[PDB]
Amino acid sequence: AAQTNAPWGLARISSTSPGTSTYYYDESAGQGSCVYVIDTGIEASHPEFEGRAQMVKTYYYSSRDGNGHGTHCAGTVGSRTYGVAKKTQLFGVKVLDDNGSGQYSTIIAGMDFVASDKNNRNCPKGVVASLSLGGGYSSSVNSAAARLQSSGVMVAVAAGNNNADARNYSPASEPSVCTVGASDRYDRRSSFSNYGSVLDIFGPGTDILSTWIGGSTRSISGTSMATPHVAGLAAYLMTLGKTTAASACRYIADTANKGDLSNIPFGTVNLLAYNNYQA
Ligand SMILES: [Ca+2]
Ligand SMILES: [Ca+2]
């Protein structure tokens, strides 16, 4: 399958070189897999989700996405026009309020919830969790992410937007999950992107067009945008049977475009997510 005039991020992860505009992918499109989006919620009624999204848990007064952040991330995972895995199932967990903030105790509870909730969902091809959030270092938050990964879920987390070493941020600093840096359309490290030895992979993160609340769309930037590219790619690869939840991050690194990025500090991997699609 090919999507013409795709968002540049979708074209980039299906190509070995920058500057293309077609998203090449296999028609299975991640059907049979499930992605939990742990964020501000998901506007499940958006036409771009085609009824494949639902809220399962909120820790606030409503389950509505009053911010837009979680709806944007979920759209990059698996909306029809802006998503990597266009046929996956999307589950929303609202651990952030409508200002984009949340206490660490709530974020930890949200991760423990996903580890248990997956056992009563029909996800035959595997389960993924996308966490476009973070803060200062906390061993309790890192531990919750490790538990979720250990329970059999592919955990993808943002490296953070501080232009610093991600070792001082959580859950980005947890080694056992998949920490995602951001790049721009000219194969440069995004100027805001964190770096360091804890990073596993880079994904497109600057000027990412995706769904927004009110049934609309908009373009924003962040490692929050790179993470759902990798979470979506994981579910796409799990549906194809190429990898498992326990080894998805390593498989993606092994099969990534190597050495294409510039402004990568010494000690940080130069690896860009890539789907290796061949018609
Ligand atoms: Ca290349
Ligand atoms: Ca890792």
Swiss-Prot record:
Could you list this entry's UniProt keywords, alphabetically sorted: Calcium, Disulfide bond, Hydrolase, Metal-binding, Protease, Serine protease, Signal, Zymogen
GO BP: proteolysis
Domain of life assignment:
Eukaryota
Give me the disulphide-bonded residues.
Answer: C34-C123, C178-C249
- Domain (Peptidase S8) ranges: 7-279
Q: Does the keyword Transcription regulation apply?
A: no
Which residues participate in Ca(2+) 2 binding? T16, D260
Q: Which cofactor does it need?
A: Ca(2+)
Kindly state one GO CC term assigned in the UniProt record. Answer: extracellular region
Look up the coiled coil feature and give its residue ranges: none
Instruction: List the catalytic residues.
Output: D39 (charge relay system), H69 (charge relay system), S224 (charge relay system)
Q: What is its EC number?
A: 3.4.21.64
Membership in a protein family = Belongs to the peptidase S8 family.
State the protein's name: Proteinase K
Q: Which organism is it from?
A: Parengyodontium album (Tritirachium album)
Q: Which gene encodes it?
A: PROK
